[PDB]
Each structure stands twice: as C-alpha cells, then as structure tokens.
C-alpha cells in the first residue's frame, strides 16, 4: 500500500513515470477528496487521501480534456522524473456526461507553492539558494534533451510562476503545471500574463525555433529569482513578499498593462537598496538581470544559471 | 460477446470460481493489437488484486476474469467499448484500442 514504494516496484520494471496503468484506473473511484488547494492552469487542484496518503489531485472538465491530455502525457514522458520536477503518480476519470471529471493526481507538498512559502517565512542565504538552486535543476532538466533508447526530449515549460513550484518538506522545490510545455519535434500568447516576457505579449516571439520557447522560460525565472531574494535577510533587514511589478501593474494584469511596462518603457523589477550592502543579494540581483535581458539571445541558460548559483553555494561553504 | 474474447492458454482447476465479492489475485501482461506492451505485473513481480463488482477495472477484464478457474490462463481480447473506449488512456492507450491481456487467476481471496 505504501505508495512511494508501489511507485518504486513499477519504475524499476520500467517505461513509464507513475503506477502501471491498470492500478492508475482504480484510483478515481478510491480517493476521498478533501478540499481545494489551489489553482492549476485549466482546473482546480484538490488535495485527496488515498490509502490514508495526502495525494494532489488536479480536476480538469471535459471541456478541457485535451489538456488533461497533454499534460499526462508529458508527466509520463521517459527519463522525465526527477527531484526538482513535481511527482506523477496516476491519471483516471469519474463521472458522467457533462459532469465528467478527468484527474491528474500528483505528490502533495504541504508547505504549497514557493508564492505561500515566501508569504510564510523570511530567509537565510543558504535556504534562498536551496530553493533557487533546486528550482533552476528542474528547468535546466526540463530543457535538456536526454538521449537514450527511449529518449527525453528537450522541453521549454512556458508558465513559469511561483505559483507553479512547490517547496518539499526538505526546502527543496520542484516544478509542476506542465500544460502549456513544449517539446521539440502552439500558439505564442499563452501562460500568465505578468511573467510574460516582452516577445510573448507582442507576439514577436520566433516560431521558427524551439529555443525561443526555452529563452523564454529565462526571463520568466529571472522574475522569481527577484521574488525569492526579498525574502532573504541581511543586516537585519528584509522586504514583506510580493509578486513581480507589484508596484506598476494591478493584480490579475493584462496584456496592455504588461506590454506598456516591459515592451514599451522596458522597465524590470526594482533592486532594494540594501542588496548592494551584501556580496550574495549583489550577485543574484546580476543573475536576474542577466535572466531577464529585454534580446532574448543576451538571457543566461538555465545550466548557467544553475552553474553559477552552484559556485554561490559552495562559495559560503553551503552544500546543494 | 464478442466485445470479450476468452482463450485458455493452459487450464485452472475447473471448480474455483470468482463470486462477486471475492478479492482476484492475478498476473497479467497487457498489449496493444500491434503487440506493444503497456503493463506488466510479471515484470514487477507483484501479483495484482481486485474485488469482481467494485469496477476497480475496465468491464471486460471483470467479465473475462470471473469466468476463469484458480489456476487458469487466459489469453482476453477486449474491444474498446469493453476496455477505455474513445478516450484511452494518455500516452498508454490510444483511442479506440482493442487490448490483449494474457492473465491467469492465481488465487481467490
Ligand atoms: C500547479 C501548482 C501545484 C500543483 C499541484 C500541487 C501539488 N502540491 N500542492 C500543494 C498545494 C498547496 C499546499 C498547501 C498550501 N498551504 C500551506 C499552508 N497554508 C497556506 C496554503 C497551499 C498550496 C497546491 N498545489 C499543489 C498538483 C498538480 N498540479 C499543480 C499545478
């Protein structure tokens, strides 16, 4: 019953992330629903109890099965699991007729997404890093390609928000919401609106190459990056959370907010001034602002990033 | 039906049957028509249970299996209406497949 291990003896046979089907399709009709969690793009996210075990549940509609399709697919794409990319476990249907209910049952994290997190609790150096560090592990894993016999292609996540990792009970995160994920073998303006990057709110992004998709992603990152670092303390003193243009957008902004902001005045978030007291804040505020480069092609990789959030860790004698 | 065909591949003792109500143990393989294999418990070495009636799973295993012996393996052809219809499953089963299990019933509890 113990489900890490039910889930530990199917991969270990082998091919797909997740149980074996014929024990995915008796889940529906088991799980106790508990109450709604959140948000996910295209339905609701519950947390439910399966076997006396806190699983997440993600509740797409009929209407949007074509999401739910895409998005279990690419959940149970090969080599795809990893630490720093939220747990699949199952996907199933209930119900009837137009009340049908399509679920995408995945680990549950009780500290939620790094947006409820950073509203808890202040940080150290060492717990910004863990979480930066984990989250960017799980993008750089996302756009490399992993070439086996059964291959990984590279995969650009395109609704990156802080609502969509999760903080594990470790302090680590990991990446969810991947309903919107490209692989390279879509319409532009998709994902939300405030971490759109410039190209994507005035649809000069370049179809042409999948890079573009992954670049993207870059900037998207580099506006969490900003959210993590308020949080962090030093010299006593830290920032109360908030989302990115907090101060030139309202909330729920759309894309004629956005493009004013980034496309035409090509503002960025604003540095706090104690950053430039502290060598760390300093370099991860250089870190954004190189994620975040209005030319798409000046972005850092997620492997550079990840690269030097590695040398900031081990620089502070800090491990992972 | 022909929605559930059931060929013995090697015989069950004949007189063990599944009531409603009883826990099925099995081992099974299960295949696309193509011959591509989706799931295996043989290859996790875990035999797999469900209760006949709950519809725990798809119709026509609970239609073929009820009908097998302890001991009996059956090779169950199921078309799609009796399996995950026009829908399949995401990455797993496409839409309207016919699916092949090999299974054998290996103990009623
Ligand atoms: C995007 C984001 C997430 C998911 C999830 C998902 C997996 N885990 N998980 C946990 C929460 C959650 C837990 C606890 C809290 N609080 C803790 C204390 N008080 C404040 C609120 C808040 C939120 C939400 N969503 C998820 C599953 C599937 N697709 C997704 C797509």
């Known amino acids: 019953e113990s489900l890490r291990d039910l889930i530990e003896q199917s991969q270990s046979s082998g091919s797909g992330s997740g149980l074996p089907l014929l024990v995915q399709r008796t889940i529906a009709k088991q799980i106790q629903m508990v109450k709604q969690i959140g948000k996910g793009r295209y339905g609701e996210v519950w947390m439910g109890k399966w076997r006396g075990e806190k699983v997440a549940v993600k509740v797409f509609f009929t209407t949007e099965e074509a999401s739910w399709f895409r998005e279990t697919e690419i959940y149970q794409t090969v080599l795809m699991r990893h630490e720093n990319i939220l747990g699949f476990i199952a996907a199933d249907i209930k119900g009837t007729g137009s009340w049908t209910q399509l679920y995408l049952i995945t680990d549950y994290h009780e500290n939620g997404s790094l947006y409820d997190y950073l509203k808890s609790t202040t940080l150290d150096a060492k717990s910004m890093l863990k979480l930066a560090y984990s989250s960017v592990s799980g993008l750089c894993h996302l756009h490399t390609e992993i070439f086996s016999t059964q291959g990984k292609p590279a995969i650009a996540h395109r609704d990156l928000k802080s609502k969509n990792i999760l903080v594990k009970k470790n302090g680590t995160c990991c990446i969810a919401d991947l309903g919107l994920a490209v692989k390279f073998i879509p319409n532009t303006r998709v994902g939300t609106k405030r971490y759109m990057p410039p190209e994507v709110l005035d649809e000069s992004l370049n179809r042409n190459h999948f890079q573009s998709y992954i670049m993207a992603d870059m900037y998207s990152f580099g506006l969490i990056l900003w959210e993590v670092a308020r949080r962090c303390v030093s010299g006593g003193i830290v920032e109360e959370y908030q989302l990115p243009y907090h101060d030139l957008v309202p909330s729920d902004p759309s894309y004629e907010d956005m493009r004013e902001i980034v496309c035409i005045k090509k503002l960025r978030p604003s540095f706090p001034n104690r950053w430039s007291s502290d060598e760390c804040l300093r370099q991860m505020g250089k870190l954004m602002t190189e994620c975040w480069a209005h030319n798409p092609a000046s972005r850092l990789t997620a492997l550079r990033v990840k690269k030097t959030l590695a040398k900031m860790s081990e620089s502070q004698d800090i491990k992972l | ?109």
């Open chain 2, 1 to 109: 039906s022909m929605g559930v065909q059931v060929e013995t591949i090697s015989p069950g003792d004949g007189r063990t049957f599944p009531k409603r109500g009883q826990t099925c143990v099995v081992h099974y393989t299960g295949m696309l028509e193509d011959g591509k294999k989706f799931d295996s418990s043989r290859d996790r070495n875990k035999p797999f249970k469900f209760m006949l009636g709950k519809q725990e799973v798809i119709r026509g295993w609970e239609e073929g299996v009820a009908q097998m012996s302890v001991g009996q393996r059956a090779k169950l052809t199921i078309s799609p209406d009796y399996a995950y219809g026009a829908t399949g499953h995401p990455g797993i089963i496409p839409p309207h497949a016919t699916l092949v299990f090999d299974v054998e019933l290996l103990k009623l509890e």
